[PDB]
Amino acid sequence: GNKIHPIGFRLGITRDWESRWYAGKKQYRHLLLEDQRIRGLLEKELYSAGLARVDIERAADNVAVTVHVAKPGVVIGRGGERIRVLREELAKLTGKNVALNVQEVQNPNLSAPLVAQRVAEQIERRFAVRRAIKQAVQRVMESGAKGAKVIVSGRIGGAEQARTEWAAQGRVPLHTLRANIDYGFALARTTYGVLGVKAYIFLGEV
Amino acid sequence: IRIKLRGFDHKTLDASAQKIVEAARRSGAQVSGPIPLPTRVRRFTVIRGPFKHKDSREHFELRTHNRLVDIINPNRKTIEQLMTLDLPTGVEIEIKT
Amino acid sequence: PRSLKKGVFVDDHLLEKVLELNAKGEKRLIKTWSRRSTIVPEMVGHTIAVYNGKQHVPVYITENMVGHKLGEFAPTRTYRGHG
Amino acid sequence: ARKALIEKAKRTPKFKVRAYTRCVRCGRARSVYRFFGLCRICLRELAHKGQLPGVRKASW
Amino acid sequence: ARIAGVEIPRNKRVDVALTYIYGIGKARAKEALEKTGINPATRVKDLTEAEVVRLREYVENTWKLEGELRAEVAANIKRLMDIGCYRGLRHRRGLPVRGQRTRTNARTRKGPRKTV
Amino acid sequence: TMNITSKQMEITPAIRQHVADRLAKLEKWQTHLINPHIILSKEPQGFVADATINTPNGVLVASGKHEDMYTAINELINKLERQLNKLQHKGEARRAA
Amino acid sequence: EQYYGTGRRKEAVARVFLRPGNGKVTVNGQDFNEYFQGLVRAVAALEPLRAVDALGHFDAYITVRGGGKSGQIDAIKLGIARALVQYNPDYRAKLKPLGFLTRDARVVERKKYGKHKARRAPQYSKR
Amino acid sequence: ARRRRAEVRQLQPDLVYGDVLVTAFINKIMRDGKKNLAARIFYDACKIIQEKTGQEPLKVFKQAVENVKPRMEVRSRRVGGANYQVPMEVSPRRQQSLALRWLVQAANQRPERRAAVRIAHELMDAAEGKGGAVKKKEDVERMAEANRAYAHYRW
Amino acid sequence: GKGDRRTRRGKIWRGTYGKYRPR
RNA sequence: CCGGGCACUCUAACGGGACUGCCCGCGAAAGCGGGAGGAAGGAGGGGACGACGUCUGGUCAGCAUGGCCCUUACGGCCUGGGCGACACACGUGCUACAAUGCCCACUACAAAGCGAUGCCACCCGGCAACGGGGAGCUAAUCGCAAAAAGGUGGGCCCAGUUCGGAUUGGGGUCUGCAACCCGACCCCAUGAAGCCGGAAUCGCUAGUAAUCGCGGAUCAGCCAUGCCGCGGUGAAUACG
Ligand SMILES: [Mg+2]
Ligand SMILES: [Mg+2]
Ligand SMILES: [Mg+2]
Ligand SMILES: [Mg+2]
Ligand SMILES: [Mg+2]
Ligand SMILES: [Mg+2]
Ligand SMILES: [Mg+2]
Ligand SMILES: [Mg+2]
Ligand SMILES: [Mg+2]
Ligand SMILES: [Mg+2]
Ligand SMILES: [Mg+2]
Ligand SMILES: [Mg+2]
Ligand SMILES: [Mg+2]
Ligand SMILES: [Mg+2]
Ligand SMILES: [Mg+2]
Ligand SMILES: [Mg+2]
Ligand SMILES: [Mg+2]
Ligand SMILES: [Mg+2]
Ligand SMILES: [Mg+2]
Ligand SMILES: [Mg+2]
Ligand SMILES: [Mg+2]
Ligand SMILES: [Mg+2]
Ligand SMILES: [Mg+2]
Ligand SMILES: [Mg+2]
Ligand SMILES: [Mg+2]
Ligand SMILES: [Mg+2]
Ligand SMILES: [Mg+2]
Ligand SMILES: [Mg+2]
Ligand SMILES: [Mg+2]
Ligand SMILES: [Mg+2]
Ligand SMILES: [Mg+2]
Ligand SMILES: [Mg+2]
Ligand SMILES: [Mg+2]
Ligand SMILES: [Mg+2]
Ligand SMILES: [Mg+2]
Ligand SMILES: [Mg+2]
Ligand SMILES: [Mg+2]
Ligand SMILES: [Mg+2]
Ligand SMILES: [Mg+2]
Ligand SMILES: [Mg+2]
Ligand SMILES: [Mg+2]
Ligand SMILES: [Mg+2]
Ligand SMILES: [Mg+2]
Ligand SMILES: [Mg+2]
Ligand SMILES: [Mg+2]
Ligand SMILES: [Mg+2]
Ligand SMILES: [Zn+2]
């Protein structure tokens, strides 16, 4: 085990923090806990909508939870029934002026957090893992990516002897700093244990 | 007539120090240019592994950058258009006299 | 040791029984889990069972042992050498 | 015995000496930082994710 | 056997030579020559007989020394070993007294190694 | 001297003495056995006897495995002997030319 | 009229001010022989002008800040070695081949995890 | 090293005689990077050389260097099944290095209490052909001659 | 040396002050 | 320090800069040696960064998670004790065995950091640890802060010592509800081993090794001589 987090390895060069706000020493932990509590409920709820990233900004007394997603209406609801329902339950935790936006994901098959979750959904549905992994890679490359790599590790197919299966097409240069690489992880929970799913998408250099 | 700007990302800390020494400059009169104060560097060093392997670490830093600006010739025409200011989210302004 | 500016510490709950016995014309065997409590001259002559973590050790208190703590007289580690 | 100990650390104690910091994420008692309320593992986990404002990998 | 019962070394300075007495260190070397007004640099070989008996007298009447200091230190260790306190037991075994670890080291109190 | 570690098992002073008596077979070669260290442990398939020993002419590192623990100890010795006899005689091989 | 150079070493910065005169030298409110009193490495500072015969031609006003006394001394050496160049362009000859008009980047190497120092590794027993 | 030769570090001349060899001698005296002490001991001895013997410290110091340079030495080598002391010529770099090393090492064997006294006196004796330093150079040379019969193994 | 509390050099080592290292 | 100023130093953001680009030569070429310019030259020095895989490596005790197992107890609260035990054995370190040293007094020269029940100037009491006053600083402002080795002068005189600072007696400080087990520090006294270390073995190729001090995280305090950083002084050697 030896590979650096390819997002944490690009914070501030190719990627941008999911919680962007200044805060002095006596407050950092207090807001930081909020973002985590905020994200805990949200990733549970907006799961069914295709959640990808949750940007969080703060000024003073307020906080603007921007949410990117594949199916926007599943968050909004009918006219705004669910989107207003969220801010309601949201302001209980926030205890303050918690705005909430929703953002369209252009191609969900170019978002690594999404293809990872879909793979994890397939293997939970008792799908042929190796064939599934090749499908995801094929869906990402057909959608215009310049390279993709998907990894699935654990009791694949339910065998006692754990195994690591992966597939890749095109270019995934994990050492290149200027290379825009999206990364996402999902956690297929099976009757016999956990399988970890990693997805790499190469969107091009800069 | 003092405005202090603290923030983590220096791209927003500088672009916001520009949009004051530009705004109050036109609105008259004297603005003493943004002075980059030294950065205060919080440091975090942790073992990469969750168990033993004591001799492998990763270095993290949190950078509280600092800027100071003097709008030297106040004029309450400046101290009005600044009241509604489009400062990015990740910046903190302090204003004293 | 403990700052002279502060007081001579006794748990005050152990100390209550000492004075209630002195008045009544003491004594009776006092069970305590107070090793931290200083011996004080009101205790001289009594016998107090001090918990070492396992047993309460009956210790008789004399004139010479007053500045100490009750734990110093109920050792906690059974040891008789090796071999 | 651990979740009963994550709760006992939140309670205020009889004496202010028994105050000890835990992880507000995993309940870890050791290598827990004051600035984050996070242990050294969650610290590296979230920071790698990007969910710590300003925090970045330091190389010099 | 001059002062104070120890024939303190000549050839050396008085402040040094006084330290060759049980109970007089550097701190009491600075003290004894201040009260009796003697240059602490003067060698014992050059003490005037008045300076000697002046330095002898203050030294012996102010502090407990050699023999009597040894008796008290012993008597204190004896009674600690008699009331049966924790510091007493460690003296009844030769084991250390100030909380030090004994799994390793502790060879000053234990003595050179006892092979098994 | 010689140290014996029983990892995640418990053993008697008798078994520790057996190991010392078996390691004594290495004394045959009349070379210095410098801080010999035996590790005993149990896998799901049987016992594992590890050993690290330095001598004036190199190190001995061997691992024995077997259902029966005394046999795993003996397999360890057999591997240790062939390593020691190699360390002691290999230099003799190229005396000519 | 006045002649200035910037001299930097390990963590020392030295601002030298050359002024024609007899040779008196001032470093931080003191005379040279008073500030570097007892240091043998000191005389090495005045060397760039022994390469161009300015032994007593100039006087020295010199500030000093950061690092240690020898790095300051060497920073000074680079300082005046630059002020003479602006006093005469044709001083690269008989100063640049003498290594005087350059600054060595030899600086403390960073402490690194795993090691006791920059490179000194912890002791271990292989067996 | 394996890939290429190593480049000999040039030393800046000292600031009392302008000598690069005098510098290397100071460094050999230097313990714990206390160069100020190192220089002071040498020069302190350069006064003692002058005051016990009225002539040039620089000249005395340099002659004692030539008096400790070993012209040949033995360099081991295993030939078949025997370790042979092969006689070998010493490069001038190494001659210098051995000279300075033995000077200090032999000086610090001396009984004189203050170091600069030991550095002066040893350089005084070695300037004339005496002292444990020059002995060490003679001893090494006699070893090389004693083994001239093995001089054909030289590499 | 540094292990000697009763000297300045020992107090510099410990990181404390006293009669043998005043403030 | 006031006036005045951004020159300089600095601070911190954006750039320029080095490419075998030029010259000499060997080359089929790629490159190699040598030269000039230059602050830097052939990856400029250090960093971050670790391929498919290996060790059925490590971690169910950071977290997650399959399954097996406990349910007035294999769960939960508490007081106390233990994790600090000590015939021994190994690993890592600290301090040393002294004069290129030890002590005292005086006197310079850093960097990176940290600091609103926090950092504490300065005053007073105490030999001191520290205590009582009390100003400043949301901190390039005020503070921790003295850097130490070094420099000057004086003591020591080769001795188990003015080396070494273990061990123990007695007396105090402080944190803390509480220092018996089991805290750090101060003061008096005690003043051990150790006279440079067998077999064997570690590190380091340049601002490195060696040596000197400073800071931080954890933290009421602290068993830190540990760890992660920071600068000061500053070597030896590489035939192969
Ligand atoms: Mg380590
Ligand atoms: Mg239990
Ligand atoms: Mg749990
Ligand atoms: Mg605590
Ligand atoms: Mg904690
Ligand atoms: Mg004495
Ligand atoms: Mg202890
Ligand atoms: Mg103990
Ligand atoms: Mg053993
Ligand atoms: Mg066992
Ligand atoms: Mg193994
Ligand atoms: Mg056999
Ligand atoms: Mg800088
Ligand atoms: Mg001078
Ligand atoms: Mg260093
Ligand atoms: Mg190791
Ligand atoms: Mg040498
Ligand atoms: Mg010799
Ligand atoms: Mg001769
Ligand atoms: Mg001493
Ligand atoms: Mg300018
Ligand atoms: Mg080349
Ligand atoms: Mg690379
Ligand atoms: Mg678990
Ligand atoms: Mg489990
Ligand atoms: Mg089942
Ligand atoms: Mg306990
Ligand atoms: Mg433990
Ligand atoms: Mg044993
Ligand atoms: Mg041993
Ligand atoms: Mg240690
Ligand atoms: Mg050791
Ligand atoms: Mg050491
Ligand atoms: Mg701190
Ligand atoms: Mg002695
Ligand atoms: Mg002896
Ligand atoms: Mg002594
Ligand atoms: Mg005591
Ligand atoms: Mg305690
Ligand atoms: Mg001696
Ligand atoms: Mg030494
Ligand atoms: Mg050997
Ligand atoms: Mg190398
Ligand atoms: Mg030293
Ligand atoms: Mg420190
Ligand atoms: Mg602390
Ligand atoms: Zn955690």
From Swiss-Prot, chain A:
Gene Ontology process terms (BP): translation
Domain of life of the native organism: Bacteria
CDD domains xref list: KH-II_30S_S3
UniProt-listed SMART domains: KH
Quaternary data: Part of the 30S ribosomal subunit. Forms a tight complex with proteins S10 and S14.
UniProt lineage: Bacteria, Thermotogati, Deinococcota, Deinococci, Thermales
UniProt record similarity statement: Belongs to the universal ribosomal protein uS3 family.
Stored InterPro entries: KH_dom (IPR004087), KH_dom-like_a/b (IPR015946), KH_dom_type_2 (IPR004044), KH_sf_prok-type (IPR009019), Ribosomal_S3_C_sf (IPR036419), Ribosomal_uS3_bac-typ (IPR005704), Ribosomal_uS3_C (IPR001351), Ribosomal_uS3_CS (IPR018280)
Species the sequence originates in: Thermus thermophilus (strain ATCC 27634 / DSM 579 / HB8)
Protein name: Small ribosomal subunit protein uS3
Swiss-Prot record, chain C:
InterPro entries found in the cross-reference section: Ribosomal_uS19 (IPR002222), Ribosomal_uS19_bac-type (IPR005732), Ribosomal_uS19_CS (IPR020934), Ribosomal_uS19_SF (IPR023575)
Gene3D superfamilies assigned to the protein according to its UniProt record, in alphabetical order: 30s Ribosomal Protein S19, Chain A (3.30.860.10)
Signal peptide (residue range): none
Keyword presence, RNA-binding: yes
Keyword list, A-Z: Ribonucleoprotein, Ribosomal protein, RNA-binding, rRNA-binding
GO MF entry, a single one: structural constituent of ribosome
SUPFAM superfamilies in the cross-refs: Ribosomal protein S19 (SSF54570)
Xref: Pfam families: Ribosomal_S19
Subunit structure: Part of the 30S ribosomal subunit. Forms a loose dimer with protein S13.
Function: Located at the top of the head of the 30S subunit, extending towards the 50S subunit, which it may contact in the 70S complex. Contacts several RNA helices of the 16S rRNA.
NCBIfam families: rpsS_bact
Similarity comment text for this entry: Belongs to the universal ribosomal protein uS19 family.
Name recorded for this polypeptide: Small ribosomal subunit protein uS19
Species for this entry: Thermus thermophilus (strain ATCC 27634 / DSM 579 / HB8)
UniProtKB/Swiss-Prot annotation, chain D:
Top-level taxonomic group: Bacteria
Annotated function: Required for the assembly of 30S particles and may also be responsible for determining the conformation of the 16S rRNA at the A site. Binds 16S rRNA in center of the 30S subunit head.
Keyword annotations from UniProtKB, A to Z: Metal-binding, Ribonucleoprotein, Ribosomal protein, RNA-binding, rRNA-binding, Zinc
GO biological-process terms attached to the record: translation
Record has Zinc as a keyword: yes
Protein name per its UniProtKB record: Small ribosomal subunit protein uS14
GO cellular component: cytoplasm; small ribosomal subunit
Binding site for Zn(2+): C23, C26, C39, C42
Cofactor note text: Binds 1 zinc ion per subunit.
Subunit annotation: Part of the 30S ribosomal subunit. Forms a tight complex with proteins S3 and S10, which cover it.
Cofactor: Zn(2+)
GO molecular function: rRNA binding; structural constituent of ribosome; zinc ion binding
InterPro entries, A to Z: Ribosomal_uS14, Ribosomal_uS14_bact, Ribosomal_uS14_CS, Ribosomal_uS14_sf
Curated annotation (Swiss-Prot), chain F:
Keywords on record: Acetylation, RNA-binding, rRNA-binding, Stress response, Translation regulation
One GO molecular-function entry: ribosomal small subunit binding
Residues with the N6-acetyllysine modification: K65
Induction: During stationary phase (at protein level). Also by cold stress, remains ribosome-associated for the 4 hours tested, then disappears when cells are warmed (at protein level).
Any single GO CC term annotated in Swiss-Prot or TrEMBL for this entry: cytosolic small ribosomal subunit
Gene Ontology biological-process annotations: dormancy process; negative regulation of translational elongation; negative regulation of translational initiation; response to cold
Phenotype seen when the gene is deleted: Non-essential gene, increased formation of inactive 100S ribosomes in stationary phase, which persist longer than in wild-type. Double hpr-yfiA deletion mutants form 90S ribosomes. A quadruple yfiA-hpf-rmf-sra knockout strain is significantly outcompeted by wild-type after 4 days growth. No visible effect on viability or growth rate at 37 or 10 degrees Celsius, slight effect on bulk translation and timing of expression of some cold-shock proteins.
Region (Interaction with 16S rRNA): 22-25, 82-90
PANTHER family for the chain: 30S RIBOSOMAL PROTEIN (PTHR33231), RIBOSOME-ASSOCIATED INHIBITOR A (PTHR33231:SF3)
Record-stated family: Belongs to the HPF/YfiA ribosome-associated protein family. YfiA subfamily.
Designated name of the protein: Ribosome-associated inhibitor A
Native source species: Escherichia coli (strain K12)
